[PDB]
Write a protein that binds this ligand. Sequence first.
Ligand SMILES: CC(=O)N[C@@H]1[C@@H](O)[C@H](O)[C@@H](CO)O[C@@H]1O
Ligand SMILES: CC(=O)N[C@@H]1[C@@H](O)[C@H](O)[C@@H](CO)O[C@H]1O
Ligand SMILES: CC(=O)N[C@@H]1[C@@H](O)[C@H](O)[C@@H](CO)O[C@H]1O
Ligand SMILES: CC(=O)N[C@@H]1[C@@H](O)[C@H](O)[C@@H](CO)O[C@H]1O
Ligand SMILES: CC(=O)N[C@@H]1[C@@H](O)[C@H](O)[C@@H](CO)O[C@H]1O
Lengths: 47, 46, 47, 46, 47
Amino acid sequence: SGFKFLFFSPDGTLYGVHNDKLYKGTPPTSDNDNWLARATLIGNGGW
Amino acid sequence: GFKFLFFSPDGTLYGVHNDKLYKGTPPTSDNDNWLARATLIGNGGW
Amino acid sequence: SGFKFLFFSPDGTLYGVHNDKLYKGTPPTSDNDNWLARATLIGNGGW
Amino acid sequence: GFKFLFFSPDGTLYGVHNDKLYKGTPPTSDNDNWLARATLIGNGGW
Amino acid sequence: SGFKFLFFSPDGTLYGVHNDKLYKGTPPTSDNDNWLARATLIGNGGW
Ligand SMILES: CC(=O)N[C@@H]1[C@@H](O)[C@H](O)[C@@H](CO)O[C@@H]1O
Ligand SMILES: CC(=O)N[C@@H]1[C@@H](O)[C@H](O)[C@@H](CO)O[C@H]1O
Ligand SMILES: CC(=O)N[C@@H]1[C@@H](O)[C@H](O)[C@@H](CO)O[C@H]1O
Ligand SMILES: CC(=O)N[C@@H]1[C@@H](O)[C@H](O)[C@@H](CO)O[C@H]1O
Ligand SMILES: CC(=O)N[C@@H]1[C@@H](O)[C@H](O)[C@@H](CO)O[C@H]1O
């Protein structure tokens, strides 16, 4: 369930591994922000 | 407990607790109830 | 046994969850340095 | 997949995969096979 | 086997928990760099 990894790059971008895939994006600022729907897909598997 | 607990480079503490994502300035003593004051920035899926 | 989380803040302070409690302190530079005995207790439970 | 995955403060991605330590600039798109180009910086023991 | 935690300080030093002990050092630069053999032991137990 949820993320396997969740962490920041030093430039303040949020990265996460979810369902073996890698995502990044600006971190959310309220629970109304669906982060995973807007996050940039940057790895399609293997994570 | 928390599943993830980690800093942003601007020094904000982030944690995932009960599937929810929270941020806040880090607690400064054993009297500081972090979860009661942290900003809820995601509810579910974390 | 040991810590559940152990990570840095961006100013160089070491943070750690140990026995569900949160601690912080300047990291040790030798194994003679009992870090947990000097660390600041910043959370008494729930971590 | 990875056992650890994390940044160095200069912006380089580090990962432990199959006991090995790898680093490299993070991927920009899912067309980028990161593990295939990452620099192997440790062969075992991670 | 391997490490329980592996992470950076903001000054670029690699830290690792290995067999309950805390180590630090410049990150390895190649597979010919035996890191654990040259890392600085900074904690002998409890991690
Ligand atoms: C761990 C890793 O490098 N995985 C990459 C994946 O993210 C990328 O989408 C693909 C491009 O073909 O090459 C991989 O499998
Ligand atoms: C992992 C993730 O992105 N979870 C978000 C959640 O935090 C947010 O509360 C919800 C409604 O906006 O949308 C979810 O998808
Ligand atoms: C996870 C969290 O916020 N834990 C805090 C704890 O560290 C603090 O000692 C107490 C009241 O002081 O409030 C708790 O629940
Ligand atoms: C954890 C660690 O230090 N592992 C190193 C490995 O990365 C390196 O490839 C090898 C030969 O130099 O020495 C091992 O001890
Ligand atoms: C987690 C912690 O602080 N462990 C310390 C250890 O690194 C140090 O070698 C020792 C010296 O007495 O004090 C230990 O218990």
